[PDB]
Each structure stands twice: as structure tokens, then as C-alpha cells.
Design a binder for this molecule. Sequence first.
Ligand SMILES: O=C(CCN1CCN(c2cccc(C(F)(F)F)c2)CC1)c1cc(O)c(O)c([N+](=O)[O-])c1
Ligand SMILES: C[S@@+](CC[C@H](N)C(=O)[O-])C[C@H]1O[C@@H](n2cnc3c(N)ncnc32)[C@H](O)[C@@H]1O
Ligand SMILES: [Mg+2]
Length: 213
Amino acid sequence: DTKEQRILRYVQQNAKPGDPQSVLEAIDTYCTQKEWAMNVGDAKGQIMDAVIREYSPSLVLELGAYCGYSAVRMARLLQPGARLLTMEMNPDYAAITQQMLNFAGLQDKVTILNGASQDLIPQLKKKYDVDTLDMVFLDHWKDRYLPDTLLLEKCGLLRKGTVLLADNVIVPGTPDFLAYVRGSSSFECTHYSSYLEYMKVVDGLEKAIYQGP
Ligand SMILES: O=C(CCN1CCN(c2cccc(C(F)(F)F)c2)CC1)c1cc(O)c(O)c([N+](=O)[O-])c1
Ligand SMILES: C[S@@+](CC[C@H](N)C(=O)[O-])C[C@H]1O[C@@H](n2cnc3c(N)ncnc32)[C@H](O)[C@@H]1O
Ligand SMILES: [Mg+2]
């Protein structure tokens, strides 16, 4: 079997069904004591929680689901009627994420889009009845952060006030994206210093609020 399968099994045998909180703790425990995995983690996760609470978004778009850690993290805090759409190109990971959401009992709030962000973003308004996004969580391959941000803007998916939250702006780093948003008058950026998931290495999240053209 695979690492992702082992994590899922760990959650089923250790977490409490329908309890998003126990699911998160089960995953963090497994990754802290058995195998490192690219989940955003609890340190950065707590910062995410605080940002979600402040903005209370109704429509959130996540780029990069993996095993569903951050999706469960964000969805558990969404207000009734809110929706979370998450894109995952690896069909194997998308399957795990779906199972993770089901076990957490958050399957009704989340919709998994299986495909590459560059191919799916142009189809959001048409196929998923999306006007504009309240918040976007960037956490897929780092070289896609800038091009996908430009794609979201081109397709008119961003509006004044849309919050973009990006992971790993320090480690592994996202050079072009970070330079672009911090230098553009279209974005108001704030940096939250934290730590790389399951490690003492310093990393951080960048919050970039779209101001419009
Ligand atoms: O950190 C990485 C990748 C970087 N990598 C260096 C090695 N390191 C690690 C493990 C055990 C042990 C040791 C060592 F033995 F060196 F100590 C090192 C694991 C991590 C990372 C993090 C993310 O949040 C992402 O979204 C993301 N994406 O999307 O690609 C990538
Ligand atoms: C770090 S993992 C996401 C982990 C998740 N954010 C969490 O906090 O647990 C990044 C995911 O990006 C996804 N992937 C990479 N590039 C993608 C793209 N352009 N569109 C969709 N999925 C992509 C990968 O398949 C990978 O599972
Ligand atoms: Mg990450």
C-alpha cells in the first residue's frame, strides 16, 4: 500500500467518525510519529483557523487537496450554506480526500474537482455555479501559484476583498508569486510567520487581499 492509504487507515482505526477535530489530530499524530506528509499541519493550521474565523467566507476554493487535511480543517469552520471546492489532479489522492471527508462527516460542504487547476479554473463559473470567490487557498505545486492567480483574475473569479492565502512562501518557497503580489498595487499582503509542518524549520503563509484592477 501507499503512505496516503496508511494515513487514511490510521484515521479510520483511531479517529472518531463524524468528528473533524479527532480526524485532524489523528493525521497530525501519524505524521509526527510515523511518516512526514505534506499536510499544512497544526502550527500553520491554527493561523488558517483564525483567518477563516475573521472573514467567514461563503465560497472557498482550495488548490491542492492531497489527503484532505486542510479541506477538513477549513470546512469544519464554514457557516451553514458555505461551500468549499478543492482541486486535486492526482486521482489517487482525490479518492483518499473523498474518504477523509466522508469519515469526518463534512462531505456535504465540500466538492472535489478532479483535474489540473489550469484546466478547471476556466470552467468554474459555468459548471459549478460560481460568480466570485471569497477566499482561495493556494497549496499545490509552487510554480503554479503565479500562473493560476493570473488565470483566476482573467476569468473574473476574484473581486475586491477576495482573500488569497498561500502556503510555503518561505519553504519550499514561491519566488515569483511572492514578488508579484507584494509588488502589485492590486494586492494588500500580510505575512504570518510559522513553521514547516511537522518540523522546526521556519515557513509562513502569505495573505494577499485582492483590491481590484
Ligand atoms: O516541505 C516540502 C517539500 C520539502 N521536503 C524537504 C525534505 N523534508 C524532510 C522530511 C523528513 C526528513 C528530512 C531530513 F532527513 F532531511 F531531515 C527532510 C520533507 C519536505 C513541502 C511542503 C508543503 O507544505 C507543500 O505544500 C509542498 N508541495 O506542495 O510540494 C512541499
Ligand atoms: C501539499 S499537497 C496539498 C495538501 C493539503 N493542502 C493539506 O493541507 O493537507 C499539494 C497537492 O497539489 C496538487 N496538485 C499539484 N499541482 C496541481 C494542479 N495544478 N492542480 C490540481 N492539483 C494539483 C497535488 O496533486 C498535491 O496533492
Ligand atoms: Mg503546503
